[PDB]
């Protein structure tokens, strides 16, 4: 009894004690699967107990996975009792074709209804444009609207009242607002108490719209998140397939659309490619102008081309996947019958169509195309536009997989896809420019080959097969060709082709060509590698034609370098370190070293921005000659190395790249020290045979020796007797003065005294400066290497004496 008084006197003390132990039990019971203990089969104001139970019941619908429609309907049923309204409805906000509309989702909701009796299927949808009555007014107003008395108070519509044989006099609606965009509109119609709705009902609606707003907010965000995720995947997957290869437009578009077929969420969709021909040829225009054929009168693209779908790609995803490509589709093709792709190509506008059969503007198929009864219900068509604002194709997307019309999110998804495809038309354009540019290059390269390759009439000046046997060279046996050449080729000893003082002045170009073939014979490489005689003669003659008719770098310079290399191997005994295969490539590389020399320096190619300069950033003319020399060797009739096996061919080529590029003076000035080390080390061996055997094995030092030997041969004109040198000089200076004039007129630059005509009388001073700076090191070391190349050093020393004498006279 005492405790009873203590609890009863201090009622507050009994409160938090109840809160301490009996509060968890209350909350757990209330939040569990319980139904509100309020007599909804009545009409009265709710006290705190009933109000709390209604709130708790609405809170109980916040379970996982948030079924949006069921939870909203539950709020609607409670709002029926609280607001004393008769029926409630919900209008989802939707936007297609840029205009907004409201589509019914829940209709005829009363306090004694179920979800199935009020849910609205897409086929039973009622669509309200924003320019209509109270439903449209609320969406535009974004504020509670209370139609208090009757329908004579502006912006009221009678369609649904006639459609549903119902009468609406009292309306109180409010929009569900997701920050700045309207998601749905909730509405009440009529009121079974008497005179409409009071401000209390507006407060009740606002109070209990908090739960409905949260449910729609989750539903709206999940849909937005899913749509944006699909757009990211579409762009990524499309980019992956676009950049896989460089292919034409039909192959590229087919790959991209097929890959992203999962994210589009459509049953069927097809793409029609328009012809891009803007102008016809003259012979196709003549019949029209002369009246033979009537002019074109069909629809035209905005840029001014005839609308002609030449290829249509069809994707079918009904359940039996099928992809077809139709060339020249018939005008009654199922995709093109409606005329919508033609309309899109004509106007270039994005088209969104709901209820395609009921659309009278386009002749859509009202019959089931498929045996399963696949109606065409929703269609969305947009044009594919390249960077020139021309229409490349029309992409059409048919019924969605969920049955709902294409809203603003579907339009944005496919618009990004068509924007990406329209941009990616650049790749097929480059691919078409690819084949044309490659074919044009091959055509011109074949044109050069004819102008340089020796023909059947010119080869008879050396082979003379017609006079001896009466047959053409390609019919004569190798023994017969050898017998003719033996009596035609000049004698090596008589012409002194293996001497360091040999002069080409009293010989003609044909005699130089005959000499060149003889040097190949004297190396015993024709029989060893089974080089065909006709190919050898044709190759040497084509080399004669390849060299330009310029002052110094003509074919005569090419032979003198090649002749010197032959003498260095034979007379200089530098062949003792090299194999027969290498000597064959080394001599051949010398003959082709400055093959298509234009008479201009490497630095000139830098300054004039020649196509050679852009192609070869490094040493230019050395690489250009190497490429051209290989091109001549690749031809069948000119391929000397055609009888060499795989291993020998690459080794022969490898010597050719190094030797030809070694002719650059920039490379020589960098590696001249390494050659000095090699020649210095050569003196640490007891016998010459020991050094030789070491040289056959090491390949890096063989290449460096070969690279230096190219430099010695290239400048070998300085070692010739004074009579030959005095004419070779002033013959290359003429080439330098021509380039100097080119730089003055073309580049508006003052040339160096080496290139200047005004300093012609100062030339001998530069030659001494040239000998003392470049040529002296080449031959001083080589003469130290081999005692047999002493005449080269003796020749240049004599020449420097004469040039110095001339320079002394000038001073």
């Amino acid at each position: 009894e005492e405790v009873e008084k203590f609890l009863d006197s201090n009622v507050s003390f009994a409160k938090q004690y109840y809160n301490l132990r009996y509060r968890a039990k209350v909350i757990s019971d209330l939040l569990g699967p319980r139904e509100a203990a309020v007599d909804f089969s009545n009409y009265h104001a709710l006290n705190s107990v009933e109000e709390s139970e209604i709130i708790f019941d609405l809170l109980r619908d916040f379970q996982d996975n948030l079924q949006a429609e069921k939870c909203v309907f539950n709020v609607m049923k409670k709002l029926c009792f609280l607001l004393q309204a008769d029926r409630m409805s919900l209008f989802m906000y939707r936007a297609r074709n840029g205009i907004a509309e409201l589509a019914t989702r829940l209709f005829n909701v009363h306090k004694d209804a179920v979800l199935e009796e009020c849910l609205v299927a897409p086929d039973s949808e009622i669509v309200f444009p924003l320019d209509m009555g109270v439903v449209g007014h609320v969406a535009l107003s974004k504020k509670i609207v209370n139609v208090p008395n009757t329908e004579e108070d502006e912006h009221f519509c009678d369609f649904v009242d006639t459609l549903t044989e119902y009468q609406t006099k009292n309306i109180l609606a409010s929009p569900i607002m997701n920050g700045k965009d309207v998601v749905a509109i909730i509405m009440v119609v009529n009121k079974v108490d008497g005179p409409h709705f009071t401000e209390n009902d507006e407060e009740i609606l606002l109070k209990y719209l908090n739960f409905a707003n949260l449910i729609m907010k989750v539903f709206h965000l999940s849909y937005l998140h899913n749509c944006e995720t699909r757009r990211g995947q579409i762009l990524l997957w499309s980019g992956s397939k676009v950049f896989e290869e460089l292919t034409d437009i039909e192959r590229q578009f087919h790959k991209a659309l097929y890959t992203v077929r999962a994210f589009l969420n459509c049953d069927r969709y097809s793409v029609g490619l328009l012809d891009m021909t803007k102008q016809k040829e003259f012979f196709d225009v003549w019949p029209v102008l002369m009246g033979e054929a009537p002019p074109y009168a069909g629809p035209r693209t905005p840029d001014g081309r005839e609308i002609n779908f030449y290829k249509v790609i069809d994707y079918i995803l009904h359940g039996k996947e099928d992809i077809k490509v139709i060339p020249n589709p018939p005008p009654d093709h199922w995709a093109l019958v409606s005329g919508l792709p033609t309309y899109v190509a004509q106007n270039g506008l994005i088209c969104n169509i709901m209820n395609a059969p009921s659309e009278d503007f386009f002749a859509f198929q009202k019959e089931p195309l498929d045996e399963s009864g696949w109606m065409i219900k929703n269609v969305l068509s947009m044009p594919i536009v390249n960077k020139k604002e021309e229409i490349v194709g029309v992409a059409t997307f048919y019924n969605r997989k969920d049955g709902k019309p294409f809203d603003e999110m579907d339009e944005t998804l496919m618009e990004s896809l068509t924007q990406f495809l329209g941009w990616s038309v650049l790749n097929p354009d480059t691919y078409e420019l690819m084949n044309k540019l490659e074919n044009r290059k091959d055509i011109f390269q074949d044109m050069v080959k004819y102008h340089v390759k020796c023909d059947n009439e010119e080869i008879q000046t050396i082979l003379k097969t017609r006079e001896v046997y009466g047959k053409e060279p390609w019919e004569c046996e190798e023994e017969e060709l050898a017998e003719i050449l033996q009596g035609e080729l000049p004698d090596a000893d008589k012409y002194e082709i293996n001497k360091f003082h040999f002069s080409d002045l009293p010989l003609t170009e044909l005699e130089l060509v005959k000499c060149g073939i003889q040097m190949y014979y004297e190396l015993k490489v024709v029989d060893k590698f089974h080089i065909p005689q006709e190919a050898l003669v044709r190759f040497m003659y084509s080399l004669s034609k390849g060299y330009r008719r310029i002052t110094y770098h003509n074919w005569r310079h090419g032979f003198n370098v090649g002749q010197t290399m032959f003498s260095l191997l034979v007379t200089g005994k530098l062949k003792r370190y090299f194999t027969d295969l290498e000597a064959l490539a080394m001599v051949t590389a010398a003959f082709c070293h400055d093959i298509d020399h234009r008479g201009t320096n490497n630095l000139y190619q830098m300054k004039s921005q020649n196509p050679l300069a852009k192609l070869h950033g490094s040493s230019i003319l050395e690489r250009h000659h190497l490429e051209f020399g290989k091109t001549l060797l690749r031809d069948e009739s000119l391929n000397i190395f055609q009888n060499l096996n795989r291993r020998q061919h690459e080794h022969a080529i490898h010597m050719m790249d190094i030797a030809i590029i070694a002719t650059d003076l920039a490379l020589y000035f960098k590696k001249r020290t390494m050659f000095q080390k090699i020649v210095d080390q050569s003196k640490t061996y007891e016998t010459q045979q020991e050094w030789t055997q070491y040289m056959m094995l090491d390949q890096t030092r063989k290449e460096i020796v070969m690279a230096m030997m190219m430099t010695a041969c290239d400048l070998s004109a300085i070692t010739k007797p004074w009579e030959v040198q005095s004419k070779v000089a002033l013959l290359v200076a003429a080439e330098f003065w021509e380039q100097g004039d080119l730089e003055r007129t073309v580049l508006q630059q003052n040339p160096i005294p080496m290139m200047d005509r005004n300093k012609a009388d100062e030339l001998p001073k530069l030659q001494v400066g040239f000998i003392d700076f470049v040529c002296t090191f080449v031959y001083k070391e080589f003469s130290r290497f081999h005692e047999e190349i002493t005449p080269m050093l003796d020749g240049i020393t004599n020449n420097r004496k004469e040039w110095k004498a001339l320079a002394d006279e000038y001073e």
Binding site: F107, T164, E165, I350, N352, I353, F361
Partner: peptide, 23 residues
């Protein structure tokens, strides 16, 4: 059904179509 429409979505105003322009 709830909206008393079996066939398809219905709109009070049926006029010439309005189409969206490209971006």
């Amino acid at each position: 059904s709830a909206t008393r429409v079996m066939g398809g979505p219905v709109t009070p105003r049926k006029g010439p179509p309005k189409f969206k322009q490209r971006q």
